[PDB]
Amino acid sequence: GHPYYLRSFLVVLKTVLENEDDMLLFDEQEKGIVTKFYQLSATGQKLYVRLFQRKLSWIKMTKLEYEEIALDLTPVIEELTNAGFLQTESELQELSEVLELLSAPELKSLAKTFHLVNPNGQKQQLVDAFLKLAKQHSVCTWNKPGIGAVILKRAKALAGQSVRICKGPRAVFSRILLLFSLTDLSTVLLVNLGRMEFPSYTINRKTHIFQDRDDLIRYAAATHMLSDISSAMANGNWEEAKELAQCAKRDWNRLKNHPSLRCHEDLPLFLRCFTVGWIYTRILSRFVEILQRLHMYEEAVRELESLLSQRIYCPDSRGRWWDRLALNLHQHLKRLEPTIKCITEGLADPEVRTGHRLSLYQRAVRLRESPSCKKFKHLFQQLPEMAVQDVKHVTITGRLCSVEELALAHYRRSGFDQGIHGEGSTFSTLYGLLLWDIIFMDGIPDVFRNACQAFPLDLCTDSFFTSRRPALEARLQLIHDAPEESLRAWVAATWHEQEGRVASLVSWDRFTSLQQAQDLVSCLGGPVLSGVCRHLAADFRHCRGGLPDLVVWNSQSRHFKLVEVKGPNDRLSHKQMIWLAELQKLGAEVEVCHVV
Amino acid sequence: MFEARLVQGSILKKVLEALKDLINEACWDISSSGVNLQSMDSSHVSLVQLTLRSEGFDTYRCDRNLAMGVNLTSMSKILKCAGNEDIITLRAEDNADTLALVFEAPNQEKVSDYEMKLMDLDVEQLGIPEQEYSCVVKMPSGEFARICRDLSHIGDAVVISCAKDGVKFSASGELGNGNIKLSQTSNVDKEEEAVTIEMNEPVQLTFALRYLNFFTKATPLSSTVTLSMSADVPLVVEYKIADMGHLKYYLAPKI
Amino acid sequence: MFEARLVQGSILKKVLEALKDLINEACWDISSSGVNLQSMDSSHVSLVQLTLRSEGFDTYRCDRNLAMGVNLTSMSKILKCAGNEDIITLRAEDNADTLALVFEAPNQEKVSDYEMKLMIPEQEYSCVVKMPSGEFARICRDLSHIGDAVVISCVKFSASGELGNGNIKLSQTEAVTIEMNEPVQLTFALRYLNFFTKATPLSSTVTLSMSADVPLVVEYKIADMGHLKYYLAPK
Amino acid sequence: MFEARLVQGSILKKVLEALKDLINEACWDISSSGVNLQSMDSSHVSLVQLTLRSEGFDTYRCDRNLAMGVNLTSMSKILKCAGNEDIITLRAEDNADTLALVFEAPNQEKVSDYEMKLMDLDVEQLGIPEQEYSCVVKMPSGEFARICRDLSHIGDAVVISCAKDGVKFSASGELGNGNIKLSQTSNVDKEEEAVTIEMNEPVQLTFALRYLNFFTKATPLSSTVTLSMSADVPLVVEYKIADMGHLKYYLAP
DNA sequence: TCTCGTCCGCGCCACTCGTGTCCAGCGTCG
DNA sequence: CGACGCTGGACACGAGTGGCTTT
DNA sequence: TGCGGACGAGAC
Ligand SMILES: [Ca+2]
């Protein structure tokens, strides 16, 4: 059969082409390009997919080794060129590309030939010097042939054969990949996508995320520029990131008057997160991160204030920004009354939940007791009191195993034989096992688009508890008062019926065996599982993380202790504090193991 | 099918020491009056004109004009084979692209023969129409070469200004600044050390310095070097050769 | 204002060739006495002390003493642009950021100017050997070629290396003479010792001074008017 | 218990630096009386030998031979200090532990001493008996060095073409072919520059040029060199050492 | 010194290539 | 003949790209 | 966003 990369590419292409609503935005020429791709030999498709995953630049035919495709890949290259996907070195008519193609020794030799200022130097400075020399020095010198042409000819002759993926088909396939990745090539999906067996549901589509080809191209440009900004953050070139984000913000301001946007505001949130405006708001949040990194705290505050007035785009993160506007208003800049106003507005904001609601509140008390804000006697005006009950703390001394493994060994010595350490994945997996029938239920429109969708789009969005409220309430009330045998049967049936099916929640490698899952379910009981499943069903995005790490328990005594292990240089985040308090409310026994 | 014999063969070798760094390959025009090079550097900033008249070459006979482009570095490697005193003669076939160089010992006991690939390339034409140059300077070649090296020790550019007092080179770089001043001496004996300058116009003009270093490789050809320039014309650096030929380097303005 | 005209420019050339790699940056202290240079080497086991009076300079005027901190690489490269007989002039105004080197050949047909950007207890040594700089240079070079460390003994140089060992015994009668006041056997490194030998043309003979736990001193004397001393910390 | 002395200490230095690269980790098998060594090259294609007469040196210590396990790079390192006009004495310490080399200047005021631990030695002892060679030419060694150098610049394989009237070195490469013809000197002086020729039948055979360079590196030791060429057998190149020694190389194509 | 808050850097492994650094062979000029 | 100046080859790094699961 | 390192300020 086909290799893994080719398998993933064909699966993506087939899934996208099956999308009738998503096939319409592609131009007739782009559909012709796609159908030309299917008219290739297996070796041709393999080589094209192999070159697709590489960078978009000229690559020498010497550096093209692929034993899996063919020993001599020149006929495959010629077939691809005839098809129109690969342009050979004959089209390398740009000096800035051929110079980058040449290796460092070859570029040094070329610089020595042309009597450059610094023949022995960096490659980038060599390319810059070659461009500078090509700009002039030949217009009038005693015919008028451009020296740039001579440099290009010499560099092309030196580099030999070289191919590069064409702009058009590459862009078309990038947009196809983007359309596939809307519902979620990434490495996790580059390999094993042909063998992953997604869950079963009925595809139901009613609305169009994009209305025409121009909208999809705009969204692709926005997400590509967001990816460029993200790469700039990853590589640490924060000034380039700031420039790119400024250009993106000016583009967004230019585009804010587009009437097509007036349709995107009518999309549901879980579908509205796939629009150009959403991507530009995410880019503006990354711009806020850049400004905070580069210490324009006032400009970061202004950007956050502008963002916080846009209730249509990214409302779920409205907490992240409210908290940072408070921190960028009190810590980095010493404003105090505006910080109190920001805290009050954030606490009154319905979109701030869990940790980012606690953090603001903590800032609130940090301004209700500090002497610097004594004159501002308003933070006590309403300030809806939220209190997290303290949990037990146990200290451990020890020191080659991991910290969590050491804590697991400790609780093994203390009479808790069975113990697992998957943090959220232990509770998320259990919630998925218990509520697979409701998470992937039918009747909810616009949440199942493709067939390779590991999770309904309602997840990570409050609407998951709005569309399926009856069934979810019925299940969470049935689990609340249920015998251990019924819970065992439910978990066993879910595990048997759906074994190996990928899902965003259930991790089949978390439990070493089904018996461990059964024992954990029996020990946790009804109320604890009902509480955690309800808190994950309502606002899953803000309750996804911050869960305790180890679940340790004994089979005979049926005693468990959800333990959150903090290392010697660790601290309880607000999400973790909220989750520990919630588990304390549920009757579960929870404590913090501080390892020294 | 042409034959060219020369006694003081090292002279020819000296020529190969000068072109090799500047031009990797050049067109070797053949004529009854003399053999010309008429090539220019790769980077299109400098020209080299080499003329060896047939009068100096004993037993010179050429049937027709030939292009016979030559890889200069390869020819220098072949010419390194001989010594400083061997007599050198070159033979070119009627149509075969094989130039044969044979060198005979000064005592006529060691004879060496070699052949070259003699690659064929394009033969362009650069007019360099005769322009009347000004501020002609005649100075020893060694002084000029070491001045060029000293200035290249500092920066990557040079400026030359000629006035009634003399000639002045200058070079300013990031590391530092420097300049050379030479004054006309008018030696009575004229032991090739005169720095006599004729003055017609006080001009000043800028050039690159690496190409001056590549031009300085022709110093062993002769003691005297002639540098001429004007307001806008290219700099001309001429070395005579055994009263039979010349080698000229023209450099374009830096700006 | 300050001028210093030296006919023997080769002397300046070789003395700054000696300090080419010993020190990266150093200052040329100038007073009415002359030009003094007390420099801390890049390595942390050596010191440099160059002394020259004001008598040998054809012209000397020091209204205000100037540190004259010059990057030795840059000024050595500038000095490389002067001939052996090239008369060398050091100039620097009291409020000048740049130092000027004026090179004028004795034949006077040529004149050039360059501008560069300006930026131990005493104790008599128990033993001292005055021997030609060539001999000690060859000994140090060969014994560094055989090993990394050499011990000097009352003369004997013994180098220890991973490959093997070497031992050279000298004699006394361009002459070599030792006070033989005390016996010593003290080890020393070679890399800095090798660097201390680039001053072979700088002087005729070197007086290696050693004693009990006193730092090693090598001395190169200009034919007159000045001298140079390198101090090395014993191992 | 082995002692050798040479007033002209230079010749040993040139001999040792000549072999500093053509053989590494070589063997020294000097007998009780008479100095000799032989070793196959690092490429296992060519052989190098040298014979120095024991009575040619100044003195000798009456004892038995020992491995004298010598390594050239180490020796060269040690011998690099030795001058080209001083007296050199080689002394052997028992138990095959070290070898000492003492260099004393003629002025007897800057005397020196040296020594070095040796290394494990393996005896190969090829000992190929000599066979008669047809073509022989004696010519100055500097001429051979220049010829080898320029042919290495222009080619990769050297052709001998021994002949009665003279010799003709021929080769070729990507930059064309090269031929150099040396005629009989036929001068009354018969100096080292003069070349003599003795032929019985011409022999043509191509030889490698890199090892030819490695062997001509021994040019400064001898004023002249004798080349013996014969078909189907390695070329002989031979150097004379003050008529007190012979340094030979066998070059198999 | 101790405690709390805040910021900064993270796919993964191997394979090749850019890069500044160091050592040994080379032409030379007193 | 040798010491000095010049220069190219060899070398430990860190950065960048590429392949990751036809089993 | 979720992890782990680090440093900086208030109170000793
Ligand atoms: Ca943890």
mmCIF file of N, CA, C and O in Angstrom, chain B residues 6-33:
data_model
loop_
_atom_site.group_PDB
_atom_site.id
_atom_site.type_symbol
_atom_site.label_atom_id
_atom_site.label_comp_id
_atom_site.label_asym_id
_atom_site.label_seq_id
_atom_site.Cartn_x
_atom_site.Cartn_y
_atom_site.Cartn_z
ATOM 1 N N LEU B 6 60.232 33.025 -28.047
ATOM 2 C CA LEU B 6 60.678 34.118 -27.199
ATOM 3 C C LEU B 6 61.830 33.603 -26.347
ATOM 4 O O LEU B 6 61.774 32.485 -25.822
ATOM 5 N N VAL B 7 62.877 34.417 -26.218
ATOM 6 C CA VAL B 7 64.090 33.977 -25.532
ATOM 7 C C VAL B 7 63.937 34.106 -24.019
ATOM 8 O O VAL B 7 63.994 33.112 -23.287
ATOM 9 N N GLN B 8 63.743 35.331 -23.529
ATOM 10 C CA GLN B 8 63.617 35.588 -22.091
ATOM 11 C C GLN B 8 62.225 35.159 -21.624
ATOM 12 O O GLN B 8 61.354 35.972 -21.306
ATOM 13 N N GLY B 9 62.033 33.838 -21.581
ATOM 14 C CA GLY B 9 60.696 33.285 -21.433
ATOM 15 C C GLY B 9 59.996 33.681 -20.149
ATOM 16 O O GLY B 9 58.762 33.731 -20.104
ATOM 17 N N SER B 10 60.763 33.976 -19.095
ATOM 18 C CA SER B 10 60.161 34.358 -17.821
ATOM 19 C C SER B 10 59.216 35.540 -17.981
ATOM 20 O O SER B 10 58.207 35.625 -17.270
ATOM 21 N N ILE B 11 59.518 36.444 -18.919
ATOM 22 C CA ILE B 11 58.633 37.575 -19.202
ATOM 23 C C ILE B 11 57.212 37.080 -19.428
ATOM 24 O O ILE B 11 56.262 37.531 -18.775
ATOM 25 N N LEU B 12 57.054 36.105 -20.330
ATOM 26 C CA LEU B 12 55.731 35.545 -20.579
ATOM 27 C C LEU B 12 55.134 34.980 -19.300
ATOM 28 O O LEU B 12 53.963 35.232 -18.989
ATOM 29 N N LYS B 13 55.939 34.248 -18.525
ATOM 30 C CA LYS B 13 55.463 33.737 -17.245
ATOM 31 C C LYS B 13 54.990 34.873 -16.352
ATOM 32 O O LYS B 13 53.932 34.773 -15.718
ATOM 33 N N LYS B 14 55.743 35.977 -16.320
ATOM 34 C CA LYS B 14 55.327 37.125 -15.522
ATOM 35 C C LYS B 14 53.949 37.609 -15.950
ATOM 36 O O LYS B 14 53.117 37.960 -15.104
ATOM 37 N N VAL B 15 53.679 37.600 -17.258
ATOM 38 C CA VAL B 15 52.361 37.993 -17.744
ATOM 39 C C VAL B 15 51.292 37.091 -17.145
ATOM 40 O O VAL B 15 50.252 37.563 -16.670
ATOM 41 N N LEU B 16 51.549 35.781 -17.121
ATOM 42 C CA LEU B 16 50.588 34.853 -16.541
ATOM 43 C C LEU B 16 50.435 35.048 -15.040
ATOM 44 O O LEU B 16 49.424 34.624 -14.473
ATOM 45 N N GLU B 17 51.411 35.681 -14.385
ATOM 46 C CA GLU B 17 51.256 35.990 -12.971
ATOM 47 C C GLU B 17 50.322 37.173 -12.753
ATOM 48 O O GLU B 17 49.789 37.336 -11.650
ATOM 49 N N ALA B 18 50.089 37.981 -13.786
ATOM 50 C CA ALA B 18 49.288 39.190 -13.649
ATOM 51 C C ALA B 18 47.827 38.976 -14.026
ATOM 52 O O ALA B 18 46.932 39.472 -13.334
ATOM 53 N N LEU B 19 47.567 38.251 -15.113
ATOM 54 C CA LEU B 19 46.198 38.045 -15.567
ATOM 55 C C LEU B 19 45.455 37.024 -14.716
ATOM 56 O O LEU B 19 44.232 37.125 -14.565
ATOM 57 N N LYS B 20 46.178 36.058 -14.143
ATOM 58 C CA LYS B 20 45.547 34.903 -13.511
ATOM 59 C C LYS B 20 44.555 35.312 -12.431
ATOM 60 O O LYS B 20 43.450 34.764 -12.352
ATOM 61 N N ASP B 21 44.926 36.277 -11.591
ATOM 62 C CA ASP B 21 44.025 36.708 -10.528
ATOM 63 C C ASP B 21 42.861 37.523 -11.080
ATOM 64 O O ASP B 21 41.744 37.452 -10.554
ATOM 65 N N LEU B 22 43.097 38.299 -12.139
ATOM 66 C CA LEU B 22 42.063 39.208 -12.625
ATOM 67 C C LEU B 22 41.015 38.470 -13.448
ATOM 68 O O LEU B 22 39.827 38.475 -13.107
ATOM 69 N N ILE B 23 41.434 37.826 -14.533
ATOM 70 C CA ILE B 23 40.526 37.194 -15.482
ATOM 71 C C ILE B 23 40.773 35.693 -15.457
ATOM 72 O O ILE B 23 41.902 35.239 -15.682
ATOM 73 N N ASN B 24 39.719 34.924 -15.178
ATOM 74 C CA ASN B 24 39.846 33.470 -15.172
ATOM 75 C C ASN B 24 40.094 32.930 -16.575
ATOM 76 O O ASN B 24 40.855 31.972 -16.752
ATOM 77 N N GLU B 25 39.454 33.523 -17.581
ATOM 78 C CA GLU B 25 39.646 33.117 -18.965
ATOM 79 C C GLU B 25 39.529 34.342 -19.858
ATOM 80 O O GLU B 25 38.832 35.305 -19.528
ATOM 81 N N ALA B 26 40.220 34.298 -20.996
ATOM 82 C CA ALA B 26 40.284 35.448 -21.882
ATOM 83 C C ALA B 26 40.448 34.983 -23.320
ATOM 84 O O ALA B 26 40.875 33.857 -23.587
ATOM 85 N N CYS B 27 40.106 35.875 -24.245
ATOM 86 C CA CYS B 27 40.259 35.619 -25.671
ATOM 87 C C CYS B 27 41.657 36.027 -26.116
ATOM 88 O O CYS B 27 42.077 37.167 -25.898
ATOM 89 N N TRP B 28 42.374 35.094 -26.741
ATOM 90 C CA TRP B 28 43.748 35.328 -27.177
ATOM 91 C C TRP B 28 43.738 35.631 -28.674
ATOM 92 O O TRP B 28 44.004 34.773 -29.514
ATOM 93 N N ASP B 29 43.430 36.882 -29.003
ATOM 94 C CA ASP B 29 43.394 37.293 -30.400
ATOM 95 C C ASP B 29 44.787 37.219 -31.013
ATOM 96 O O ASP B 29 45.779 37.613 -30.395
ATOM 97 N N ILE B 30 44.855 36.710 -32.241
ATOM 98 C CA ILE B 30 46.111 36.500 -32.950
ATOM 99 C C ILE B 30 46.112 37.379 -34.191
ATOM 100 O O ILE B 30 45.138 37.387 -34.952
ATOM 101 N N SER B 31 47.201 38.118 -34.391
ATOM 102 C CA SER B 31 47.327 38.987 -35.551
ATOM 103 C C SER B 31 48.790 39.067 -35.956
ATOM 104 O O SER B 31 49.691 38.760 -35.172
ATOM 105 N N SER B 32 49.014 39.479 -37.205
ATOM 106 C CA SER B 32 50.378 39.631 -37.702
ATOM 107 C C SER B 32 51.121 40.727 -36.949
ATOM 108 O O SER B 32 52.314 40.588 -36.653
ATOM 109 N N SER B 33 50.436 41.830 -36.641
ATOM 110 C CA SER B 33 51.070 42.909 -35.889
ATOM 111 C C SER B 33 51.456 42.455 -34.487
ATOM 112 O O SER B 33 52.547 42.775 -34.002
#
